[PDB]
Design a binder for this molecule. Structure first.
Ligand SMILES: CCN1CCc2c(N)cccc2C1
Length: 150
């Protein structure tokens, strides 16, 4: 009963979250997960400002409307040498990572550690926030509000 949530630096309030280091989040769960961080799924605009603040990943994730990978440096194995916000057009499958957006975040680069999931509710799961620099916060809770995701 244990979930790792892997989080990135927030850029203009937009961060990256992987569940258990693999693509295993539905669109419904993307909403619930972000809402546990007191966040909403980003709009394209919020993501485009996130990107200009110096944000990139090598992983597909949900935003408001699409599944995307933000890209600064052209790389062959990430979104296929594309730069800017790369939109996934064709895919058989539903589960990816997610992006979230906290409006309370600093306006640019925020590479401080995330030490809480301030709005998770009561549950039996161990939920471990896992940071890029390795630091951890664990709490017993739940965030999934749709049974089809549990
Ligand atoms: C699998 C690549 N991801 C990269 C993202 C990430 C983060 N953000 C935090 C901890 C581990 C990881 C690993």
């Amino acid at each position: 009963q244990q979930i790792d949530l892997n989080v990135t630096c927030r850029y203009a309030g937009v961060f990256h979250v992987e569940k258990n280091g693999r693509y295993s989040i539905s669109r419904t769960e993307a909403a619930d997960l972000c809402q546990a961080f007191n966040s909403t799924l980003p709009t394209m605009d919020q993501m485009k400002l996130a990107l200009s603040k110096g944000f990139e990943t090598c992983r597909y994730g949900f935003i408001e409307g699409n599944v995307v990978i933000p890209r600064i440096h052209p790389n062959a194995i990430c979104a296929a040498n594309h730069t800017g916000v790369y939109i996934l057009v064709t895919s058989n499958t539903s589960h990816y990572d997610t992006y979230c957006f906290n409006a309370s975040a600093p306006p640019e680069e925020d590479c401080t550690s995330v030490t809480d999931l301030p709005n998770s509710f009561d549950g039996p799961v161990t939920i471990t926030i896992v940071n890029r620099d390795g630091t951890r916060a664990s709490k017993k809770g739940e965030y999934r509000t749709h049974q089809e995701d549990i």
